[PDB]
Amino acid sequence: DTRIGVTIYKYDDNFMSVVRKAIEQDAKAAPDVQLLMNDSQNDQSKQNDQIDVLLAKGVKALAINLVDPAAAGTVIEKARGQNVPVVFFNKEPSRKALDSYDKAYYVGTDSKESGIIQGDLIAKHWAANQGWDLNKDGQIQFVLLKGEPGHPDAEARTTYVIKELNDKGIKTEQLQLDTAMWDTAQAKDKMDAWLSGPNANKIEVVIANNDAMAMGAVEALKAHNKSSIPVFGVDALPEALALVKSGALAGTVLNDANNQAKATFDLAKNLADGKGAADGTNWKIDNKVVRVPYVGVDKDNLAEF
Ligand SMILES: [Ca+2]
Ligand code: NA
Ligand code: NA
Ligand code: NA
């Protein structure tokens, strides 16, 4: 069987756990492929040792989710010894590293696109629901529940949901913006304070950097009999999709783990077989990179889940 070595930066990450399982499913579906999977336990030195072991097993391709993006050159130089192709995924190597090897590729998507897709989702529903503009001023008065300060996904989602709305021509007015540390209970307590204060009846849209905080806000809204106010999240978690179905959550955003897995597997298998990376597929490889769009989820495409 053709062996493909895979390193996941750490198995105790929810998103990469979904990607990992999906890649394992995709390989199971390819009878002539054997996946050699590894948990790097958030230690690049351990990942490097794991790659030395994989190369001693004759893998024909490596799919590597780096712990440290700056280690891409080290990994490429190890793979080059046996001319083994490397498909990096989810953590992006530098452009210099990708350009240094003809058989290096990347599959992943900048986190700011999750804020841009959320902003487009809110614009889509705002334009379709005039009644949400409680003061009829054409602007969205919102509150935002931020992830942990300084976390790259909290910073990007907070900055870009608002830049995207404003770039689509929708002015916004930030009535409140605080962190709830990605947590449902903290978000319920923060939203409850806002609903007990001066802005309670002026808030038109609640924006959260993830679904857990969106769900805490939905609970506070129900407690205050203010469920008329729409809430948007990010993650498309199953418990959040159940609230999209019930009408309690207006929308959320999928980070498409299945397609990151599929693109990584399809490119790695083609390269292991000595074929063009995208042969037989419709992936777009632009300067060695496949981008996998985040996707807005609401009642239009909820049946897909
Ligand atoms: Ca308004
Ligand atoms: Na996560
Ligand atoms: Na991403
Ligand atoms: Na609501």
Which DSSP string corresponds to 217-280?
A: HHHHHHHTT-TTS-EE-SS--HHHHHHHHHTSS-BEEE--HHHHHHHHHHHHHHHHTTS-TTTT
User: Which residues have their alpha-adjacent CB atom under 5 A from ion ligand 4?
Assistant: 227
Q: By three-state DSSP, how is residue 172 classified?
A: strand
> 35: burial class by Cβ within 10 Å (0-12, 13-18, 19+)?
buried
Query: Cβ neighbours of residue 227 under 8 Å, at least 6 residues apart?
Result: 218, 221, 248
Distance CA 250, CA 252 (A): 7
Distance CA 213, CA 105 (A): 35
User: Looking up tokens 């130089």, which residue turns up?
Assistant: 77
Query: Which ligand is closest to the CA of 12, given by its number?
Result: 2
Q: Which amino acid is at 248?
A: A
Main-chain phi, psi angles of 266, to 5 degrees = -65, -40
Resolution (Å) of this entry: 1.5
Cα(16) to centroid of ligand 2, in Å?
Answer: 8
What are the structure tokens assigned to 174, written together? 């930030």
- Structural contact between residues 270 and 280, judged by C-beta atoms closer than 8 angstroms: yes
Specify the domain boundaries for CATH 3.40.50.2300 within the chain.
1-109+256-293, 110-255+294-305
Distance CA 126, CA 205 (A): 9
Q: By three-state DSSP, how is residue 6 classified?
A: strand
Main-chain phi, psi angles of 141, to 5 degrees = -85, 115
Q: By three-state DSSP, how is residue 176 classified?
A: strand
User: Looking up tokens 């319920």, which residue turns up?
Assistant: 188
What are the structure tokens assigned to 143, written together? 């509150």
C-alpha torsion 214→216→217→221, nearest 10: 140
Distance CA 266, CA 302 (A): 27
Cα(40) to centroid of ligand 3, in Å?
Answer: 19
Q: Give CATH for domain 1-109+256-293.
A: 3.40.50.2300
Q: Specify the DSSP class assigned to residue 36.
A: E
How many degrees, rounded to 5, is the angle at CA 235 between CA 229 and CA 238? 85
Query: Cβ neighbours of residue 77 under 8 Å, at least 6 residues apart?
Result: none
- Structural contact between residues 208 and 239, judged by C-beta atoms closer than 8 angstroms: no
Q: Which amino acid is at 8?
A: I
Cα(166) to centroid of ligand 4, in Å?
Answer: 22
User: Looking up tokens 């351990």, which residue turns up?
Assistant: 46
What are the structure tokens assigned to 186, written together? 């903290």
Cα(129) to centroid of ligand 1, in Å?
Answer: 12
Query: Which ligand is closest to the CA of 147, given by its number?
Result: 2
Distance CA 179, CA 160 (A): 16
Cα(200) to centroid of ligand 3, in Å?
Answer: 34
First to last CA, the chain: 33
What are the structure tokens assigned to 137, written together? 């001023």
* Interior/surface letters 188-225, b for 16+ CB within 10 angstroms, e for the rest: bebbbebbeeeeeeebbbbbbbbbbbbbbbbbbbeeee
Query: Cβ neighbours of residue 158 under 8 Å, at least 6 residues apart?
Result: 115, 144, 146, 147, 177, 209
Number of H helices, E strands in the chain: 10, 12
| Distances, alpha carbon 273 to alpha carbons 6, 84, 181, in Å | 16, 11, 45
Distance CA 3, CA 266 (A): 14
Tell me which of 2.20.28.90, 3.40.50.2300, 3.50.50.60, 3.30.565.10 is the CATH number of domain 110-255+294-305: 3.40.50.2300
CA torsion sign for 201, 205, 207, 213 is positive
Distance CA 39, CA 66 (A): 11
Main-chain phi, psi angles of 244, to 5 degrees = -65, -40
Q: By three-state DSSP, how is residue 70 classified?
A: helix
